[PDB]
C-alpha cells in the first residue's frame, strides 16, 4: 500500500493515431482513472481554453511529467492525484489565467505548453495553443518547430509544487474564520498575498518570492501554515479499488458496480478480505499511504488538498 510505485496505475502509455481525433466521455471510475494515466484530461483542458489541438504525453503518460522543484516526494506514489487530475473527477476547478495574475520567478519556463500553480485563493493554469511554446520569462507564447506533430512528449508539461489530495469531509464555516484568526500571527511581517489582504496594513513593498506550506478547505481562500504535524490514516474505502480485465479495456460501469458491491469477482488480499472473492475482472489496491490528517491548533483537520509551493508576498513599508 505505502510502497512507492515506479509504474503506471492501471494502464500503459498509449500510442495515438491522429491529432484531430475526438475524445469521448466515459462513466466508470476505473475507466476515467485509465484516462488519467494517459494524460487525456490535460488534452481536454488545452482544447477547452488554450484552443490547442492534439493529444499530450506521447509514449510516457503521467509517469513523465515535469515538476519544479525537481526533488519531489509525492510523485513516486502512483496513488496520489494532482489538481489537474482532481478536476477530471468533479473535485475542483483550475481556472484560466488573467492579466492581474502574477507568475512566480524561479522555474524553467522555456519550451513548455501548460503549467499550473496554486494561488492563495485557487489554482491558475497557463497554456499555449497549436505550434507555440513559452519564452524564458513566461510572458507570451511564440512559435516553435518542435510542435509540428501535435503529439508532444510528456516533458512539455510542468506542474509547480509538490501537491496531491483526496476526498474531503465538510467542516462548519465558522471553524475556518477562527483558524484564520490564529493564522494571522504566524507571518506578521507579510501584509498582502497575491493581491489579497492578510493583515491590516496601509503601504506595501513590491512583490517578492515567499515559501510556505498550506491546506485547502474551500470558502474564500486557503489556510497557510508555519509549523504543523501530519499523519497517514488508513481507511480502505471503495474508491481504493480499480481494475482492468486483460485484453480490451477497463470493466464496464455495470460490472464495476457489481464487483464493488456483490463480491463475485476476483480480487487481491485486501479486496478478498473486505468483501470476498469468488476470464474475469481482478481488482487490486493502489500505491498510496492512504488518507491524510493534519493537526493545527490542536483541532486536527481533514483537508481537501495539502502541498508545498512558492507564492508571492508583500511586506509593509516601514
Amino acid at each position, epitope marked *: 500500500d505505502g510502497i512507492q510505485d515506479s509504474g503506471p496505475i492501471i494502464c500503459a502509455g498509449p500510442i495515438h493515431s491522429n491529432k484531430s481525433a475526438d475524445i469521448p466521455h466515459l462513466l466508470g471510475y476505473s475507466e476515467k482513472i485509465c484516462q488519467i494515466d494517459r494524460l487525456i484530461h490535460v488534452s481536454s483542458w488545452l482544447r477547452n481554453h488554450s484552443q490547442f489541438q492534439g493529444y499530450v504525453g506521447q509514449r*510516457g503518460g503521467r*509517469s*513523465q*511529467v*515535469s*515538476y*519544479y*522543484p*525537481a*526533488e519531489n516526494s509525492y510523485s513516486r506514489w502512483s496513488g496520489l492525484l494532482s489538481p489537474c487530475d482532481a478536476d477530471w473527477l468533479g473535485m475542483l476547478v483550475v481556472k484560466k489565467a488573467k492579466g492581474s495574475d502574477m507568475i512566480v520567478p*524561479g522555474p*524553467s519556463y*522555456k*519550451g513548455k505548453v501548460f503549467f499550473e500553480r496554486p494561488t492563495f485563493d485557487g489554482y491558475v493554469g497557463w497554456g499555449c495553443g497549436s505550434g507555440k*511554446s513559452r*519564452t*524564458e*520569462s513566461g510572458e507570451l507564447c*511564440s*512559435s*516553435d*518547430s*518542435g510542435t509540428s506533430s501535435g503529439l508532444l*512528449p*510528456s*516533458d*512539455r508539461v510542468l506542474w509547480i509544487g509538490d501537491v496531491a489530495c483526496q476526498p474531503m469531509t465538510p467542516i462548519p464555516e465558522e471553524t475556518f474564520l477562527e483558524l484564520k484568526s490564529f493564522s494571522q500571527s504566524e507571518f506578521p511581517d507579510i501584509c498582502k498575498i497575491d493581491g489579497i489582504v492578510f493583515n491590516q496594513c496601509e503601504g506595501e513593498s513590491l512583490p517578492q518570492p515567499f515559501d510556505v506550506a498550506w491546506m485547502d478547505v474551500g470558502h474564500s481562500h486557503k489556510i497557510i501554515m508555519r509549523e504543523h504535524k501530519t499523519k497517514w490514516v488508513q481507511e480502505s474505502s471503495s474508491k481504493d479499488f480499480v481494475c482492468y480485465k486483460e485484453g480490451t479495456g477497463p470493466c464496464s460501469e455495470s460490472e464495476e458496480k457489481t464487483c464493488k458491491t456483490s463480491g463475485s469477482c476476483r480480487g487481491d488480499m485486501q479486496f478478498c478480505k473486505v468483501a470476498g472473492c469468488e476470464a474475469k475482472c481482478r481488482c487490486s489496491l493502489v500505491h498510496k499511504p492512504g488518507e491524510v490528517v493534519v493537526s493545527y491548533g490542536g483541532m486536527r483537520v481533514r483537508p481537501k488538498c495539502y502541498g508545498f509551493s512558492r507564492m508571492m508576498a508583500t511586506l509593509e513599508v516601514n
Partner: antibody, heavy 123, light 107 residues
Framework: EVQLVESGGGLVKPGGSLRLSCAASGFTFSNAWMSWVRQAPGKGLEWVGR??????????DYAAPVKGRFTISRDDSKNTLYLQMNSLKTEDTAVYYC??????????????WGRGTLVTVSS | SELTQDPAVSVALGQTVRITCQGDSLRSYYASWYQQKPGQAPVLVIYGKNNRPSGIPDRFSGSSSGNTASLTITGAQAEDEADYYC???????????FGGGTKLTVL
C-alpha cells in the same frame, strides 16, 4: 535533413587568432539557441559560451577563462554560427563542437551535435 | 558549483549497472545524460523525467534523489562500451556545467 557543419579551423602559432563557423540547414534557424563546447584528446567536455535568439534579445555570456579573449556571434541571413578567437594560448588545443536544441526543448538539453573541428595551438 | 562523475566503471555482460552524477545544483533542476563511443560524436540518451528519445531503447532508465541523479542500464551487452557525461546549470542561472565522465566497458 538535419545537418551541422564545422569549418574554418587549422594550425595556429601561440599568440594568434582565427575564426570558426558552424553552419546548418534543413529547418528554421531563427528561433533556436546555440552553444560551444570543446574537448582535447584525453579531456572531457568544457563549456565556452552560448548565443541566444532575438525573442529575448540574443544576449551573450562566456566563462571566465574564455571571457576577455574570445567572442561568439551569428548570422541570420547566411544562417550560421561564428566564433572569433584572439590571443590564443597553448591550453586551448582541442576539437570543437557546436550544440543546439531541436526536439527536446530546454536551455541545456542539447541533442544535435556537429562533427566538430580541430584546432592546434603550438609552435 | 560543480558536477562530479566516477572516473570509470565496468560490468560483465548480462546484468544491470548504475552510474551516479552528484551535484548540489540538482536539488531544483534535472540533468541530462550523454553517450560517446571512442571515435565519434556524443548522442543524447536521457533527459527530463525519464524521457528517452526516439531511437533509444526503453532498456535505459533515469532517476533522481536528493542531489544525485542516476542513469541505469540493464542486461549488459558488449556493444555498449562508451563514456558517459552529465550536464546541468549553475546557481547563478547563466551557465552550463559538465561532469567528468565515466568510461563504461563490458566484460
Amino acid at each position: 535533413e538535419v545537418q551541422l557543419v564545422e569549418s574554418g579551423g587549422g594550425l595556429v602559432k601561440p599568440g594568434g587568432s582565427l575564426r570558426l563557423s558552424c553552419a546548418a540547414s534543413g529547418f528554421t534557424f531563427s528561433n533556436a539557441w546555440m552553444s560551444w563546447v570543446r574537448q582535447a584528446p584525453g579531456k572531457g567536455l568544457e563549456w565556452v559560451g552560448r548565443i541566444k535568439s532575438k525573442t529575448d534579445g540574443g544576449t551573450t555570456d562566456y566563462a571566465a577563462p574564455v571571457k576577455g579573449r574570445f567572442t561568439i556571434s551569428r548570422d541570420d541571413s547566411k544562417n550560421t554560427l561564428y566564433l572569433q578567437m584572439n590571443s590564443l594560448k597553448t591550453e586551448d588545443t582541442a576539437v570543437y563542437y557546436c550544440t543546439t536544441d531541436f526536439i527536446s526543448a530546454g536551455p541545456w538539453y542539447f541533442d544535435l551535435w556537429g562533427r566538430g573541428t580541430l584546432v592546434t595551438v603550438s609552435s | 558549483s560543480e558536477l562530479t562523475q566516477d572516473p570509470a566503471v565496468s560490468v560483465a555482460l548480462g546484468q544491470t549497472v548504475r552510474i551516479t552524477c552528484q551535484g548540489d545544483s540538482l536539488r531544483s533542476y534535472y540533468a541530462s545524460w550523454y553517450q560517446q563511443k571512442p571515435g565519434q560524436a556524443p548522442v543524447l540518451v536521457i533527459y527530463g523525467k525519464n524521457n528517452r528519445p526516439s531511437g533509444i531503447p526503453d532498456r535505459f532508465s533515469g532517476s533522481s534523489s536528493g542531489n544525485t541523479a542516476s542513469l541505469t542500464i540493464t542486461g549488459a551487452q558488449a556493444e555498449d562500451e562508451a563514456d558517459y557525461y552529465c550536464n546541468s546549470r549553475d546557481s547563478s542561472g547563466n551557465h552550463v556545467v559538465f561532469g567528468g565522465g565515466t568510461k563504461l566497458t563490458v566484460l
